[PDB]
Amino acid sequence: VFSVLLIFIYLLLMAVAVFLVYRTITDFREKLKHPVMSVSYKEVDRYDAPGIALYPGQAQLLSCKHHYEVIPPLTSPGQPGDMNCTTQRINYTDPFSNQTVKSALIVQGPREVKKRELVFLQFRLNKSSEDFSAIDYLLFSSFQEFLQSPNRVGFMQACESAYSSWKFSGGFRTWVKMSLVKTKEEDGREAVEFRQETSVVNYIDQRPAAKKSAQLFFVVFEWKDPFIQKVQDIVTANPWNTIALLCGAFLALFKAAEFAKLSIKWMIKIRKR
Amino acid sequence: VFSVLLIFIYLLLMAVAVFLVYRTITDFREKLKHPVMSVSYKEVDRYDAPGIALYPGQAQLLSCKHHYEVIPPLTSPGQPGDMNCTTQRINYTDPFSNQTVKSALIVQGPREVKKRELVFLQFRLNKSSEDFSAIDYLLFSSFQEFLQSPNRVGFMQACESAYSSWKFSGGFRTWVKMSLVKTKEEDGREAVEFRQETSVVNYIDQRPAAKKSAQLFFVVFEWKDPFIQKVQDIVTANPWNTIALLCGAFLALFKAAEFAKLSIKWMIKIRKR
Amino acid sequence: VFSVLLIFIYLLLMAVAVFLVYRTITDFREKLKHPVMSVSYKEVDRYDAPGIALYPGQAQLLSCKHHYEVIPPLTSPGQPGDMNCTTQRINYTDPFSNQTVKSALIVQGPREVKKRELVFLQFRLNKSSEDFSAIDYLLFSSFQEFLQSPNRVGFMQACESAYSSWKFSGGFRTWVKMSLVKTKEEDGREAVEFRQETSVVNYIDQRPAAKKSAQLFFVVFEWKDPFIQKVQDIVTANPWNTIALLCGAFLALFKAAEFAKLSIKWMIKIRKR
Ligand SMILES: *[C@@H]1O[C@H](CO)[C@@H](O)[C@H](O)[C@H]1NC(C)=O
Ligand SMILES: *[C@@H]1O[C@H](CO)[C@@H](O)[C@H](O)[C@H]1NC(C)=O
Ligand SMILES: *[C@@H]1O[C@H](CO)[C@@H](O)[C@H](O)[C@H]1NC(C)=O
Ligand SMILES: *[C@@H]1O[C@H](CO)[C@@H](O)[C@H](O)[C@H]1NC(C)=O
Ligand SMILES: *[C@@H]1O[C@H](CO)[C@@H](O)[C@H](O)[C@H]1NC(C)=O
Ligand SMILES: *[C@@H]1O[C@H](CO)[C@@H](O)[C@H](O)[C@H]1NC(C)=O
Numbered sequence: 001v002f003s004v005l006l007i008f009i010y011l012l013l014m015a016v017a018v019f020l021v022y023r024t025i026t027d028f029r030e031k032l033k034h035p036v037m038s039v040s041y042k043e044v045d046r047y048d049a050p051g052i053a054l055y056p057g058q059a060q061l062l063s064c065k066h067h068y069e070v071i072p073p074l075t076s077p078g079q080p081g082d083m084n085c086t087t088q089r090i091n092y093t094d095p096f097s098n099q100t101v102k103s104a105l106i107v108q109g110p111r112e113v114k115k116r117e118l119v120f121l122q123f124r125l126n127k128s129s130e131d132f133s134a135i136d137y138l139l140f141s142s143f144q145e146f147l148q149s150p151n152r153v154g155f156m157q158a159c160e161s162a163y164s165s166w167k168f169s170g171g172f173r174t175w176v177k178m179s180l181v182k183t184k185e186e187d188g189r190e191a192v193e194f195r196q197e198t199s200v201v202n203y204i205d206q207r208p209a210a211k212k213s214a215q216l217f218f219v220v221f222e223w224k225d226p227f228i229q230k231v232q233d234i235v236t237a238n239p240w241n242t243i244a245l246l247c248g249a250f251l252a253l254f255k256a257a258e259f260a261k262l263s264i265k266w267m268i269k270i271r272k273r
Numbered sequence: 274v275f276s277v278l279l280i281f282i283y284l285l286l287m288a289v290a291v292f293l294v295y296r297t298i299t300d301f302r303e304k305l306k307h308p309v310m311s312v313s314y315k316e317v318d319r320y321d322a323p324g325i326a327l328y329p330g331q332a333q334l335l336s337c338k339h340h341y342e343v344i345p346p347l348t349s350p351g352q353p354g355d356m357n358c359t360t361q362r363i364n365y366t367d368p369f370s371n372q373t374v375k376s377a378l379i380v381q382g383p384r385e386v387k388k389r390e391l392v393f394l395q396f397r398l399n400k401s402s403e404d405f406s407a408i409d410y411l412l413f414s415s416f417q418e419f420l421q422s423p424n425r426v427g428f429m430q431a432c433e434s435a436y437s438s439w440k441f442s443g444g445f446r447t448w449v450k451m452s453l454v455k456t457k458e459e460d461g462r463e464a465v466e467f468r469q470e471t472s473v474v475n476y477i478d479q480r481p482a483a484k485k486s487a488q489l490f491f492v493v494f495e496w497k498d499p500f501i502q503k504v505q506d507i508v509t510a511n512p513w514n515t516i517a518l519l520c521g522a523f524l525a526l527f528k529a530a531e532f533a534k535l536s537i538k539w540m541i542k543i544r545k546r
Numbered sequence: 547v548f549s550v551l552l553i554f555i556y557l558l559l560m561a562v563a564v565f566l567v568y569r570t571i572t573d574f575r576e577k578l579k580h581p582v583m584s585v586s587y588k589e590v591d592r593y594d595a596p597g598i599a600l601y602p603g604q605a606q607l608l609s610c611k612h613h614y615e616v617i618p619p620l621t622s623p624g625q626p627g628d629m630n631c632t633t634q635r636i637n638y639t640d641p642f643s644n645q646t647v648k649s650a651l652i653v654q655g656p657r658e659v660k661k662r663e664l665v666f667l668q669f670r671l672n673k674s675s676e677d678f679s680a681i682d683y684l685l686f687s688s689f690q691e692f693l694q695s696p697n698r699v700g701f702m703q704a705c706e707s708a709y710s711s712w713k714f715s716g717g718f719r720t721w722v723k724m725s726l727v728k729t730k731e732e733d734g735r736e737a738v739e740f741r742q743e744t745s746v747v748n749y750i751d752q753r754p755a756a757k758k759s760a761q762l763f764f765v766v767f768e769w770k771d772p773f774i775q776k777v778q779d780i781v782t783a784n785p786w787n788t789i790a791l792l793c794g795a796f797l798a799l800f801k802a803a804e805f806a807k808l809s810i811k812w813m814i815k816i817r818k819r
């Protein structure tokens with residue numbers, strides 16, 4: 001009769017439900033055992049003013065200007081003048097060596113991503129014994145946060161431990177298109193990291209040869225796009241979602257139990273007749 | 274008796290169901306209030322022929338060739354010849370300054386990603402007063418779309434507003450590995466953006482010194498990988514999925530109501546006895 | 547009476563359930579028809595020792611050292627000495643031309659991402675007829691896997707087909723911050739690909755002019771961040787999840803059928819009275 005067909009259908013449905021809940025529980029198990037982080041992108045009209053920690057050493061900051069889409073031709077390269085930016089100077093011991101102190105010049109970065117706001121910095125280093133002409137730069141977010149920070153020393157070391165340190169060369173103009181990545185760790189601590197795309201442009205010096213010994217450093221800092229990349233694992237960042245998933249698994253188990261009970265009742269009814 | 278146990282179990286299950294539906298509704302609320310975009314990757318056998326908007330200014334395009342994995346040694350650098358590409362020339366006023374017109378040379382980009390198709394371009398600029406030797410380049414997709422565009426002026430300005438503008442230096446060969454990102458905005462408008470990885474190679478000039486005043490620009494355009502990155506928020510891009518989520522929440526609320534009704538019936542049955 | 551209201555409510559609920567299951571089936575259809583890959587990030591304490599396939603040609607590897615955060619000043623540039631790395635030399639025919647054999651020098655890469663382990667390599671090429679001074683480098687993962695590979699020839703060709711080949715220039719120090727992307731293809735084959743961020747630093751040669759004809763190549767290999775990017779489509783990589791989705795759709799269809807049956811029973815009860 002159709003009774004055995006209904007019993008088989010309900011048994012198959014119970015098997016389906018228990019398989020589904022077991023698969024969900026399993027996938028939750030690999031999600032917990034293998035911590036994997038999801039990636040998303042957030043669009044924002046205006047970026048928070050970042051901090052650029054430059055390490056000139058003996059190089060002198062000739063100029064620092066804010067421009068929009070265009071850097072006008074230099075009136076006289078190698079000549080200081082027209083410093084229009086908020087800069088700070090900090091001394092902190094290196095978190096790794098603990099013997100050498102790194103004197104950092106913090107510069108407020110560009111803010112208007114949609115208008116391609118450019119921070120153009122000009123350095124001049126007359127003489128050095130270093131084999132390679134470079135200036136180190138470390139990108140951190142929220143220059144105001146550093147300025148408002150109490151110690152201003154441990155913050156710089158914590159930013160040093162972050163993976164946002166690069167170097168730009170002398171004798172070249174370095175167009176840096178930086179992008180922001182915010183990671184929510186397992187501990188919940190926010191990690192701020194920077195990607196960059198670099199355009200290196202050769203600089204042709206028309207100055208008299210007598211002054212050509214000095215090295216000129218040009219760097220242009222710019223936001224690549226109004227897209228902040230957020231990296232976080234959904235299972236760990238949201239305990240409420242984990243509880244919701246467990247609750248849904250429990251509900252699925254209960255629906256499977258209800259289907260099994262209906263199957264048992266139908267089997268009893270069939271056996272009675 | 275077991276009646277009170279069953280009543281407690283059903284009450285707990287109703288609490289679980291209402292908590293689950295409330296959590297889903299809440300998470301939907303933060304998804305709407307905080308527009309966050311998901312990221313996916315699409316593999317395609319052959320890329321659409323892109324457009325490269327070069328801005329030489331006074332520089333003369335000596336050569337433009339399509340190669341496969343290998344650029345043969347130059348027969349004679351600094352000498353024009355063997356132009357084998359589809360190029361266009363467009364004049365459009367700059368969307369920002371509105372005083373300076375940007376004359377752009379559009380070049381069809383590489384197509385075969387799986388064979389590492391290379392577009393090699395050679396420019397020669399004999400003399401200029403600019404301090405920095407650079408040529409600007411803007412990457413947009415579907416060069417055919419520009420060619421088929423009616424105005425060819427507003428399209429160039431719209432591409433200018435996009436964040437895919439870089440500069441390559443003279444005296445160097447610039448291997449550009451470009452990658453395509455397609456974003457579906459809140460308005461639904463498609464935004465085409467380009468990432469790049471740049472390899473700068475110094476160029477050693479063995480030409481006679483008398484001709485060394487001229488600047489040589491070499492650029493190689495190549496697709497990095499057959500992976501187009503699509504950025505879109507699932508909640509907004511799919512209104513059908515939003516309606517489905519709301520419908521599922523309503524179904525969960527109804528199942529909670531059914532569980533509560535079963536609990537009430539069991540309580541009434543227990544009270545009767 | 548309220549009977550018609552209940553019948554309408556149940557009919558609407560059945561419509562909701564069938565709409566939800568139809569939407570799920572549809573979205574599954576576009577997921578299958580349009581293969582789209584999800585992106586995730588995995589944090590690991592220590593990276594697997596990668597392989598760097600250098601192609602010096604006639605260039606002589608002067609030096610290869612492992613450093614931590616700092617490269618000490620060079621005692622004497624252009625002078626060989628202090629080779630401390632595990633290197634291998636392999637000859638394999640190019641997978642594309644099949645006429646030219648590419649002699650590759652495989653170097654073990656950095657391992658400690660959290661301490662910024664640096665692999666610093668120094669080459670010296672006294673004379674060449676090539677117009678552009680460059681050395682090609684191909685990044686693959688698990689240098690041990692290559693070392694343990696039986697053929698060591700087909701593996702190099704397979705890595706050549708991968709999109710992780712770049713070039714670093716002579717007369718410059720190239721800080722390479724490499725990042726690892728692992729893709730699970732439709733066939734299930736693992737594809738290992740590398741992104742990089744390049745910092746090019748000009749090298750000032752204080753050596754006597756008589757030896758300045760020789761070209762010096764400096765490269766620094768470093769891991770950008772302890773974040774491996776995994777690209778895989780969930781629907782295809784997990785057949786169990788696909789079966790679970792189909793089973794859930796079947797359960798939704800059955801719940802819709804149950805709601806319709808309850809509606810029919812209520813309608814019959816209303817018609818009886
Ligand atoms: C540079 O410009 C800023 C903003 O316009 C201004 O606050 C600052 O005083 C200027 N610097 C000098 C030296 O005038
Ligand atoms: C940092 O140290 C240098 C070296 O003594 C000194 O010249 C400079 O004034 C110091 N700056 C600060 C802010 O402490
Ligand atoms: C940090 O500095 C202290 C003294 O200033 C030193 O004893 C310690 O070894 C340093 N930590 C290192 C080098 O890891
Ligand atoms: C050259 O640079 C050094 C570095 O600070 C500086 O002390 C010196 O005054 C500079 N000389 C000239 C002429 O600019
Ligand atoms: C360059 O090559 C293309 C394709 O092979 C061809 O269409 C074009 O006519 C060539 N140009 C010249 C000047 O022969
Ligand atoms: C663009 O303007 C320049 C400057 O007058 C002119 O030489 C060139 O022919 C123009 N090209 C087009 C396509 O209008």
Ligand SMILES: *[C@@H]1O[C@H](CO)[C@@H](O)[C@H](O)[C@H]1NC(C)=O
Nearest residue numbers: 366367368369370371372373
């Ligand atoms: C655009 O150009 C018009 C005239 O061509 C000018 O009046 C307007 O100010 C410009 N828009 C700007 C500069 O934002």
Ligand SMILES: *[C@@H]1O[C@H](CO)[C@@H](O)[C@H](O)[C@H]1NC(C)=O
Nearest residue numbers: 331332333397398399400487
């Ligand atoms: C040098 O370049 C300019 C720029 O167009 C060109 O007009 C001139 O003919 C070139 N001269 C030679 C000798 O190539």
Ligand SMILES: *[C@@H]1O[C@H](CO)[C@@H](O)[C@H](O)[C@H]1NC(C)=O
Nearest residue numbers: 610612627628629630631632
């Ligand atoms: C270089 O250093 C490594 C590790 O310290 C060592 O195994 C190797 O023998 C050294 N090379 C020489 C030539 O001493």
Ligand SMILES: *[C@@H]1O[C@H](CO)[C@@H](O)[C@H](O)[C@H]1NC(C)=O
Nearest residue numbers: 634635636637638647649650
């Ligand atoms: C590779 O080929 C070159 C050219 O004949 C030879 O000098 C070298 O020893 C070969 N190396 C290996 C490992 O076969």
Ligand SMILES: *[C@@H]1O[C@H](CO)[C@@H](O)[C@H](O)[C@H]1NC(C)=O
Nearest residue numbers: 639640641642643644645646
């Ligand atoms: C591979 O090499 C063989 C001979 O070694 C040759 O016949 C074949 O054409 C090559 N494959 C190419 C060039 O795609």
Ligand SMILES: *[C@@H]1O[C@H](CO)[C@@H](O)[C@H](O)[C@H]1NC(C)=O
Nearest residue numbers: 604605606670671672673760
């Ligand atoms: C110059 O480099 C070549 C390339 O191998 C080498 O054979 C030669 O010995 C080198 N000469 C000197 C003086 O280093």
